[PDB]
Amino acid sequence: PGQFGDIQSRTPESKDVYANTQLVLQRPAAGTVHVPYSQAPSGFKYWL
């Protein structure tokens, strides 16, 4: 997670894919309807 290769597919049109992105959900805040989540940012977009 957070490194180059967090998401890997075999071909540009491969329908199945391997992913290790570390999704951890946190408890939502009082009286607000939303889905807060914690996520390691894109290894590719920061790697560049």
């Binding site: 957070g2 951890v24 390691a40």
Partner: protein, 53 residues
């Protein structure tokens, strides 16, 4: 209100840790012991750094 921050990723090792950390804006970091000395250090961080402890 104030933001929280993104929980970082940790890698482990014999008697040591290595913490890979992801900021978005200038954020602080601090670390210390729990013994007779605090051995205190702290650091401002702005980019996707990893540290060893």
């Amino acid at each position: 209100r104030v933001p929280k921050a993104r929980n970082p990723t940790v890698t482990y090792g014999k008697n040591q840790v290595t913490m890979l950390l992801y900021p978005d804006h200038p954020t602080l970091l601090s670390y210390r012991n729990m013994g007779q000395e605090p051995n205190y250090h702290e650091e401002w961080v702005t980019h996707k750094k990893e540290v060893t402890l």
